[PDB]
């Protein structure tokens, strides 16, 4: 035998990414998982460096970041890279989800469920990093997200006070944010390995939705060079964002330190969250609002159950495709509404967008699938 | 027959992997310096009169 197959560690590597049988015909939409992994690695490295200069204390957090960006050699670009890498991470994440919704890869149940877990974990992590600078937006974001558990009817307020460690947001809460933000990424790493373990038991779905076991090619050299090309492209975009236009996504209100006595007139979270914010804004009831907020993501878990089609992929299903793109526009609409004041036109538009989101996932797609079946005479 | 440039290049340098690697390190040594100098020249030239190196 070759050494490639002489040994358990080596043979696992070989079954993973040398002699793995991959479909010949998968497209660019399948590159975004490797880019996700790359992004995780980038974040961990840049974070370990930042960590050695940051101060988890409310009387010096802000100024520690000032110190990083002004006195540490090239510290400014390390900061820039961390912040922009998070944004890239979520871009890839959203595109990665959407692929699977379009091409019917949710029928790999274990992979799909571990994906949902990973989405949740990544969001938690990103939010707990966003409050560390202790600027004016960070503070009130913390406040809202930790008051969320007050909606639990019997035990909520006590949960809030047990997470605060006191009567209010304060120094004891910031160190908790920092410990959790430190530890979560590694749990994410382990669960990613489990995710891929589950994947390699079946292999990759493909655009046509039919079995590809007659035309499998090896992962090396084809997809090795293909993914390397994808990485080069991602690095070009990331560099241009870091050096040529660093302030594109930046928010001025987080360059004012925190003031516990004043909330600013215009409130806006980080962009990858706006849509949830809009959903949360759309229900005139506290408990109902929070419930909707969490269901908006948890609803992905029952898509496999509502599947009626005989065919797996939307490639050959046009009515389906039309609905898919309408759903994507509803999400864009929620993102846009999240940016606007809480005033009447936007209130009404947001409520319609929310009802149409759930409607579409839960009702319209199942019924169009049945119509489609009937048109093909089965 | 026709001693052509790329064939000499293959036979002298690229045929053996060690020598290919050596060629690569030697090329990067000189590319780095030439490329830096060109870029710095262009940059300096785009905004003459505004950099403190010369105002000094």
């Amino acid at each position: 035998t070759p050494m490639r197959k002489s040994n358990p560690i080596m043979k696992m590597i070989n079954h993973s990414l040398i002699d793995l049988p991959t479909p010949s015909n998968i497209s660019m939409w399948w590159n975004f998982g490797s880019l996700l992994a790359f992004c995780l690695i980038l974040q961990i490295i840049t974070g370990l460096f930042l960590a050695m200069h940051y101060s988890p204390d409310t009387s010096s957090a802000f100024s520690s970041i000032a110190h990083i960006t002004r006195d540490v050699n090239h510290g400014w670009i390390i900061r820039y890279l961390h912040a922009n890498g998070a944004s890239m991470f979520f871009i890839c994440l959203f595109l990665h989800v959407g692929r699977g919704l379009y091409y019917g890869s949710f029928l790999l149940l274990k992979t799909w469920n571990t994906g949902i877990m990973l989405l949740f974990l990544t969001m938690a992590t990103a939010f707990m990093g966003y409050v560390l600078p202790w600027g004016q937006m960070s503070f009130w974001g913390a406040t809202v997200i930790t008051n969320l558990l007050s909606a639990i009817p019997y035990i909520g307020t006590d949960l809030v006070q047990w997470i605060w460690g006191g009567y209010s947001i304060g120094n004891p809460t910031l160190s908790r944010f920092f410990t959790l933000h430190f530890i979560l990424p590694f749990i994410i790493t382990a669960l990613t390995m489990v995710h891929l373990l589950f994947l390699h038991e079946t292999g990759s779905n493909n655009p046509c939705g039919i079995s590809s076991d007659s035309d499998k090619i090896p992962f090396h050299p084809y997809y090795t060079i293909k993914d390397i090309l994808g990485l080069v492209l991602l690095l070009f975009i990331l560099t241009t964002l870091t050096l040529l236009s660093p302030n594109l996504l930046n928010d001025p209100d987080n360059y004012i330190p925190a003031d516990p006595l004043n909330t600013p007139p215009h409130i806006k979270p980080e962009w990858y969250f706006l849509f949830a914010y809009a959903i949360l804004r759309s229900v005139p009831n506290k408990l109902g609002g929070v419930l909707a907020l969490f269901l908006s993501i948890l609803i992905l878990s029952i898509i496999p159950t509502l599947h009626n089609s005989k065919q797996q992929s939307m490639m050959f299903r046009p009515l389906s495709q039309f609905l898919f793109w309408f759903l994507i526009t509803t999400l864009l609409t929620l993102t846009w509404i999240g940016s606007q004041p809480v005033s009447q036109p936007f209130i009404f538009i947001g409520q319609l967008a929310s009802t149409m989101y759930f409607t579409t996932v839960l009702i319209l797609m199942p019924l169009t699938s049945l119509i489609e079946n009937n048109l093909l005479k089965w | 027959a026709a001693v052509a440039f790329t064939s000499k290049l293959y036979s002298l340098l690229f045929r053996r992997t060690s020598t290919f690697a050596l060629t690569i390190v030697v090329g990067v040594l000189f590319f780095e310096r030439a490329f830096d100098q060109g870029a710095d020249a262009i940059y300096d030239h785009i905004n003459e009169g505004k950099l403190w190196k010369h105002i000094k």
């Binding site: 039919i210 050959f316 048109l375 | -």
Partner: protein, 104 residues
């Protein structure tokens, strides 16, 4: 009555919109292989099995090459063969019978 011609009209429209005929594929080729479908495929005679396998490989190759067949070679709506339906119906009957035994 006319209603037959009308329904067949919309059905032909939907078939051309789907476009698996552009790849040289039959409808029964495009099913997802659940348990029953795999058992129906097991039951095919050799000639049908081999024809199916080649047709599918050819579609995959075209998809790899972002191309389609010449229009002259597209599958036409009026002369298609539902070769797998009969076997599938039998498989499903058998499973239904067993279920019905299991509740007594």
């Amino acid at each position: 009555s006319a209603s037959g011609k009308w329904l067949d009209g919309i059905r032909k429209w939907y078939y051309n919109a789907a476009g698996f005929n552009k790849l040289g594929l039959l409808r029964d080729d495009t099913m997802y292989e659940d348990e029953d479908v795999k058992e129906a495929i097991r039951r095919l005679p050799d000639n049908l099995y081999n024809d199916r396998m080649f047709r599918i490989k050819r579609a995959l190759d075209l998809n790899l090459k972002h191309q389609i067949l010449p229009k002259e070679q597209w599958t036409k709506y009026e002369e298609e063969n539902f070769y797998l339906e009969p076997y599938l119906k039998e498989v499903i009957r058998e499973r239904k019978e067993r279920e019905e035994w299991a509740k007594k």
